[PDB]
Amino acid sequence: FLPLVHNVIKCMDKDSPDLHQDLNALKTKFQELRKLIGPEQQQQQLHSLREQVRTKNELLQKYKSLCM
Amino acid sequence: FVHVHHLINEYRPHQARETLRVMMEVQKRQRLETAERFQKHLERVIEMIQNC
């Protein structure tokens, strides 16, 4: 999250020299990014899907040899 | 009447034998046709299977 670090750096550099106060802009941008962005459950689901796809491919290839 | 009875008795067995032979031939032909149709169907099934 480079935005929070950049906001903290700007607030620390502009503590005494408050020429351009972008604290509100940074907070609004952070809130908007958090609203727009939206555990290992996804990884487990992906592993299960990969295993199921491998099983389906194996089952499809099991019916390759067929004479009559 | 005697001649008619004799002719009927003479024509019954030959006609029965001819009908039995024709029925056997028809059964053989139907069985062969069914076997050929089943073979062609199995060939088409194998073709459709190997298609995918």
Swiss-Prot record, chain A:
Residues forming coiled coils: 18-66
Compartments in which it is found: Nucleus
Protein task: Component of the Mediator complex, a coactivator involved in the regulated transcription of nearly all RNA polymerase II-dependent genes. Mediator functions as a bridge to convey information from gene-specific regulatory proteins to the basal RNA polymerase II transcription machinery. Mediator is recruited to promoters by direct interactions with regulatory proteins and serves as a scaffold for the assembly of a functional preinitiation complex with RNA polymerase II and the general transcription factors.
Family: Belongs to the Mediator complex subunit 9 family.
Quaternary structure (record): Component of the Mediator complex, which is composed of MED1, MED4, MED6, MED7, MED8, MED9, MED10, MED11, MED12, MED13, MED13L, MED14, MED15, MED16, MED17, MED18, MED19, MED20, MED21, MED22, MED23, MED24, MED25, MED26, MED27, MED29, MED30, MED31, CCNC, CDK8 and CDC2L6/CDK11. The MED12, MED13, CCNC and CDK8 subunits form a distinct module termed the CDK8 module. Mediator containing the CDK8 module is less active than Mediator lacking this module in supporting transcriptional activation.
Protein's name according to its UniProt entry: Mediator of RNA polymerase II transcription subunit 9
Native source organism of the sequence: Mus musculus
Primary gene name: Med9
From Swiss-Prot, chain B:
Subcellular location: Nucleus
Keyword terms of this UniProt record: Activator, Isopeptide bond, Nucleus, Phosphoprotein, Transcription, Transcription regulation, Ubl conjugation
A single GO molecular function term of this UniProt record: ubiquitin protein ligase activity
GO CC, any one term: nucleoplasm
GO biological process: positive regulation of transcription elongation by RNA polymerase II; positive regulation of transcription initiation by RNA polymerase II; protein ubiquitination; regulation of transcription by RNA polymerase II; RNA polymerase II preinitiation complex assembly; somatic stem cell population maintenance
Transmembrane segments: none
Highest taxon listed in the record's lineage: Eukaryota
Family classification: Belongs to the Mediator complex subunit 7 family.
Quaternary structure and partners: Component of the Mediator complex, which is composed of MED1, MED4, MED6, MED7, MED8, MED9, MED10, MED11, MED12, MED13, MED13L, MED14, MED15, MED16, MED17, MED18, MED19, MED20, MED21, MED22, MED23, MED24, MED25, MED26, MED27, MED29, MED30, MED31, CCNC, CDK8 and CDC2L6/CDK11. The MED12, MED13, CCNC and CDK8 subunits form a distinct module termed the CDK8 module. Mediator containing the CDK8 module is less active than Mediator lacking this module in supporting transcriptional activation.
Its biological purpose: Component of the Mediator complex, a coactivator involved in the regulated transcription of nearly all RNA polymerase II-dependent genes. Mediator functions as a bridge to convey information from gene-specific regulatory proteins to the basal RNA polymerase II transcription machinery. Mediator is recruited to promoters by direct interactions with regulatory proteins and serves as a scaffold for the assembly of a functional preinitiation complex with RNA polymerase II and the general transcription factors.
Protein name from the UniProt record: Mediator of RNA polymerase II transcription subunit 7
Upper lineage: Eukaryota, Metazoa, Chordata, Craniata, Vertebrata
Gene name of the encoded protein: Med7
